[PDB]
Design a protein around this ligand. Structure first.
Ligand SMILES: [Mg+2]
Ligand SMILES: [Mg+2]
Ligand SMILES: [Mg+2]
Ligand SMILES: [Mg+2]
Ligand SMILES: [Mg+2]
Ligand SMILES: [Mg+2]
Ligand SMILES: [Mg+2]
Ligand SMILES: [Mg+2]
Ligand SMILES: [Mg+2]
Ligand SMILES: [Mg+2]
Ligand SMILES: [Mg+2]
Ligand SMILES: [Mg+2]
Ligand SMILES: [Mg+2]
Ligand SMILES: [Mg+2]
Ligand SMILES: [Mg+2]
Ligand SMILES: [Mg+2]
Ligand SMILES: [Mg+2]
Ligand SMILES: [Mg+2]
Ligand SMILES: [Mg+2]
Ligand SMILES: [Mg+2]
Ligand SMILES: [Mg+2]
Ligand SMILES: [Mg+2]
Ligand SMILES: [Mg+2]
Ligand SMILES: [Mg+2]
Ligand SMILES: [Mg+2]
Ligand SMILES: [Mg+2]
Ligand SMILES: [Mg+2]
Ligand SMILES: [Mg+2]
Ligand SMILES: [Mg+2]
Ligand SMILES: [Mg+2]
Ligand SMILES: [Mg+2]
Ligand SMILES: [Mg+2]
Ligand SMILES: [Mg+2]
Ligand SMILES: [Mg+2]
Ligand SMILES: [Mg+2]
Ligand SMILES: [Mg+2]
Ligand SMILES: [Mg+2]
Ligand SMILES: [Mg+2]
Ligand SMILES: [Mg+2]
Ligand SMILES: [Mg+2]
Ligand SMILES: [Mg+2]
Ligand SMILES: [Mg+2]
Lengths: 117, 48, 200, 103
RNA sequence: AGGGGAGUGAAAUAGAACCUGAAACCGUAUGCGUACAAGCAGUGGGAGCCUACUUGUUAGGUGACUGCGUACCUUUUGUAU
């Protein structure tokens, strides 16, 4: 029983070349270069699922910092007061109130100052 | 009891492992032989 | 242990032959051994030794700029020999006499439990005529049946030689695979007793 | 009218009649659930800042469906060390609909 | 030479280098991007535009701007090397 590889080899190349769609040059039409691009794109995707959580937290902090100083308080003095009173709202929700519900953010900030911190 | 229904007891027949077929099989590349040396080559056998 | 006969009374057959356990892993081994023993191994390919030509170095060892080659009939090359070319061999296994007999004692017992063994008095047909055996088999109501007799008649073998799903066999010639393959099995009372004095 | 609730370890800003996907909840489709862990509720110009939980405030919602997110693919590769692994993942979620907010 | 019709045929994108007819490679057409911008060419975020339709918590194409990021194999104490 002789086995011919023509039919299963073609389906295996096509799976890789379909994931390499949109790449530049030989990275989307020759298998050797496209295989390495698909493997490398999967290393970055794994690693940037971690950075995505870091980059958004740094963005929320930088925006609470800007919003707190318009009310006369730094970011670090705000967080100390918030932990002091009882408040435990996220950084994700605090950054959302800073942009949109500015009148609600003001009440939270002056609550943190009233905690003498 | 049909010709497509009967089978052997579990543990009575194994698959035989073939070295040199990819990374996932645990026998790819060097095929369980280690790196260079005499006992990694064709006919590389040490006399009793 | 009672085996029902189609016209007479039950004939009180021995417990061991008809009515033992089903050793499934032993029937599998006896079936596999039978099929492996029925194939002829007649194939062959050619190694690099026995493909015609290729006795000289195509080019010198160094200086050309090409990879090193030693013959044109190399397994790497297009017309070269097969790396592990085949030779005729035999796929013949050993089965002990008592393992073979044990398997028949498992098939026979399991047929009685599946109600796919039919026992009748003497099965005889006069003159070799396929049309006449077709009529006689429908009185029993059988389509896909193996007929087992103490000694196969000449008239009975000549009829049903052309009939599609009907096979006529001897007691000592009935292989394990046939007793599983056919939908029903038909045995005479004399053929039952012959099984008793072989399988115990 | 909006509020802040806690579900699945995360916090959500929620207004009435809003669809959203949260972590899987052990509730069938169609039933009703109550979020008693309410950190903040606002109604226009009256905002009740929640010391840890607002006293008596709650949010009513109903389960719409269950499902799985899109597949993510995990590839673990260590170069020129003869190693590679692959995996797939779909995360379960629950979609709820907000039908009540009161402080 | 080669073609456009017309005829034959169930079918000529079965037309004689004639069954099926993939990939590398080379073109035409449409959509979006691209001439103040520095690097393994991707990914996290992300505007705008184009098309379709269940008319925007939807689907497909493109990807301005931006964080991170020196291919694969082998051989090595150790390679973007
Ligand atoms: Mg291949
Ligand atoms: Mg691209
Ligand atoms: Mg292409
Ligand atoms: Mg490999
Ligand atoms: Mg290993
Ligand atoms: Mg070993
Ligand atoms: Mg080696
Ligand atoms: Mg060594
Ligand atoms: Mg080596
Ligand atoms: Mg060694
Ligand atoms: Mg050495
Ligand atoms: Mg040798
Ligand atoms: Mg010759
Ligand atoms: Mg020779
Ligand atoms: Mg010679
Ligand atoms: Mg060859
Ligand atoms: Mg070849
Ligand atoms: Mg040949
Ligand atoms: Mg013998
Ligand atoms: Mg026949
Ligand atoms: Mg490498
Ligand atoms: Mg065609
Ligand atoms: Mg051609
Ligand atoms: Mg044909
Ligand atoms: Mg053709
Ligand atoms: Mg093509
Ligand atoms: Mg163009
Ligand atoms: Mg300038
Ligand atoms: Mg410009
Ligand atoms: Mg440049
Ligand atoms: Mg550059
Ligand atoms: Mg991007
Ligand atoms: Mg993205
Ligand atoms: Mg889109
Ligand atoms: Mg980028
Ligand atoms: Mg950079
Ligand atoms: Mg190499
Ligand atoms: Mg070296
Ligand atoms: Mg060195
Ligand atoms: Mg370099
Ligand atoms: Mg290099
Ligand atoms: Mg390095």
């Amino acid at each position: 029983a002789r086995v011919k590889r023509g039919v299963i080899a073609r389906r295996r190349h096509k799976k890789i070349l379909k994931l390499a769609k949109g790449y530049y040059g030989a990275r989307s039409r020759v298998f050797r270069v496209a295989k390495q691009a698909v493997i490398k794109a999967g290393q970055y995707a794994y690693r940037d699922r971690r950075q995505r959580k870091r980059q958004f937290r740094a963005l929320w902090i930088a925006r609470i910092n800007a919003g707190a100083r318009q009310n006369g308080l730094s970011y670090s003095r705000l967080i100390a007061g918030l932990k002091k009173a009882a408040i435990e709202i996220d950084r994700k929700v605090l950054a959302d109130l800073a942009v949109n519900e500015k009148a609600a953010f003001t009440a939270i900030v002056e609550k943190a100052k009233a905690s003498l911190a | 009891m049909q010709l497509n229904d009967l089978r052997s007891a579990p543990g009575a027949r194994r698959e035989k492992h073939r070295p040199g077929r990819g990374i996932g099989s645990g026998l790819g590349k060097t095929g369980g032989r280690g790196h260079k040396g005499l006992t990694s080559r064709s006919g590389g056998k040490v006399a009793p | 242990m009672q085996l029902n006969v189609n016209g007479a009374q039950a004939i009180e057959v021995s417990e061991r032959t008809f009515g033992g356990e089903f050793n499934e892993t032993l029937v599998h081994q006896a079936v596999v051994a039978y099929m492996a023993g029925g194939r002829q191994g007649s194939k062959a390919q050619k190694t690099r030794s026995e493909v015609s030509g290729g006795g000289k170095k195509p080019w010198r060892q160094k200086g050309t700029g090409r990879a090193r080659a030693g013959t044109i009939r190399s397994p790497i090359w297009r017309g070269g020999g097969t790396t592990f070319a085949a030779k005729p061999r035999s796929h013949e296994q050993k089965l002990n006499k008592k393992m073979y007999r044990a398997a028949l004692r498992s098939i026979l017992a399991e047929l009685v439990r599946l109600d796919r063994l039919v026992v009748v008095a003497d099965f005889a047909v006069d003159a070799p005529k396929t049309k006449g055996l077709v009529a006689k088999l429908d009185t029993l109501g059988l389509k896909d049946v193996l007929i087992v007799t103490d000694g196969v008649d000449e008239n009975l073998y000549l009829a049903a030689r052309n009939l599609a799903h009907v096979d006529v066999r001897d007691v000592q010639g009935s292989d394990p695979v046939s007793l599983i393959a056919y939908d029903k099995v038909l045995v005479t009372v004399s053929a039952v007793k012959k099984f008793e004095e072989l399988l115990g | 009218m909006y509020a802040v609730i806690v579900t699945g370890g995360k916090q959500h800003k929620v207004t009435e009649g809003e669809f959203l996907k949260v972590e899987k909840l052990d509730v069938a489709t169609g039933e009703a659930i109550d979020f008693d862990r309410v950190l903040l509720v606002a109604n226009g110009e009256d905002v009740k800042i929640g010391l840890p939980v607002v006293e008596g405030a709650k949010v009513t919602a109903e389960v719409v469906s269950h499902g799985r997110h899109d597949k993510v693919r995990i590839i673990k590769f260590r170069r020129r060390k003869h190693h590679m692994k692959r995996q797939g993942h779909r995360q379960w979620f629950t979609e709820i609909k907000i039908t009540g907010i009161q402080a």
